[PDB]
């Protein structure tokens with residue numbers, strides 16, 4: 091039985107002021123590097139424990155001992171994502187009901203139906219880059235966020251955000267990005283009751299009303315039309331939970347749509363941005379991925395079956411998720427009193443945070459080359475220890491979007507590698523911006539067209 095370390099304190103604010111930064115996840119990663127596999131983190135009225143080792147996280151991933159907790163970030167996002175899948179407790183009726191209804195919508199089989207809509211947006215990205223003049227560059231996270239937002243609009247509810255036609259965001263996205271900024275900024279606030287936050291609170295309520303009004307209108311407009319498009323909204327309007335026999339109500343459907351728009355905007359765009367960063371910084375890896383793209387993608391438009399054959403591209407995406415898991419943490423609570431790692435007693439209700447980027451740097455798992463970009467690490471999943479790699483979370487509360495995200499990212503990265511050579515023309519220094527998620531900021535490249543027609 092060991093006493094766990096704790097980072098520096100600020101009197102009655104305890105560790106809270108360590109989060110007073112634009113990069114709190116990266117600050118927690120530096121704390122983990124200093125203090126090791128487990129540390130205590132206290133704020134007024136709250137204690138959690140940050141886990142960084144596979145040794146402890148493999149125990150935390152035991153669903154008999156630990157269930158998903160809503161971190162403060164997820165409790166603040168719940169003010170607009172409601173009892174959608176991502177911000178519901180496992181024990182709320184709407185979690186299992188929506189999980190049962192939506193699982194068939196997110197299977198590998200469902201991806202065959204979403205593929206044509208994903209190709210529509212991927213072709214828009216390739217045509218944009220084909221049309222750049224010689225003196226121009228690509229704003230990588232900007233263009234990847236245009237793509238992933240448009241994909242989930244089209245597969246989610248047959249709506250075109252038309253992100254490649256504008257710089258000014260859609261009114262829904264203005265409100266969603268500002269609501270996510272308020273939720274994440276509110277985490278650090280020592281004095282949230284201070285009148286100085288009255289305007290923030292007014293604006294947040296306005297942004298919730300904008301998101302609710304626009305998504306409620308999408309649902310009402312679909313029910314009125316009777317249109318049976320092959321999208322998540324049709325699946326939610328028609329689907330019945332096998333257990334309860336009940337469908338989702340229109341309020342829960344709205345929360346699921348808001349949740350899918352958050353995910354599409356924030357996550358897959360980060361993965362694609364980090365993958366392109368690592369490829370331009372590792373030219374031998376880029377060459378190997380480009381060779382696979384050329385060998386497999388033999389038609390003007392990729393098919394579902396061709397994307398399934400981009401195995402090395404899939405290993406590139408896993409190695410990008412290893413070094414920079416764009417959704418960088420998840421939270422657990424102890425279902426009963428238990429001992430972690432034979433050393434750290436926990437009481438029922440005690441909270442843990444899994445720091446995914448640190449888990450992914452555990453040298454006892456990956457070896458001394460842990461900071462190197464080596465997709466070949468993922469050749470054989472049986473050679474990877476249990477719970478070493480958790481970019482989609484754990485167990486029944488793992489990401490429902492995992493198949494969707496990896497299909498879109500594999501398709502797009504394969505088309506990018508087929509159609510262009512890339513230059514790191516600025517010798518870009520990685521700068522990671524934190525929203526709900528991690529993304530490179532200011533990452534720019536030049537593309538040189540291979541002049542292969544679509």
Ligand code: HEM
Nearest residue numbers: 175176350353357358417420481482483487489490491495
């Ligand atoms: C690379 C892309 C993505 C990453 C890294 C990612 C990561 C994650 C992680 C780590 C969780 C678990 C969170 C927790 O335990 O608190 C999660 C849950 C979830 N993700 Fe994703 N995600 C991705 C893409 C998507 C997409 C595209 C969608 C939907 C369109 C989506 C929908 C969800 C939902 C609904 C949950 C909650 C599942 C449940 O508890 O029932 N994700 N995701």
Ligand SMILES: O=C(COc1ccc(OC(F)(F)F)cc1)N[C@@H](Cc1ccccc1)C(=O)O
Nearest residue numbers: 133136161162163164277417418419443526527
């Ligand atoms: O450690 C984190 C990391 O923040 C994120 C949590 C989830 C998250 O969601 C996702 F990973 F899905 F993106 C993104 C960031 N958050 C903690 C920070 C905190 C605040 C107050 C007291 C103690 C601790 C939290 O939100 O509870």
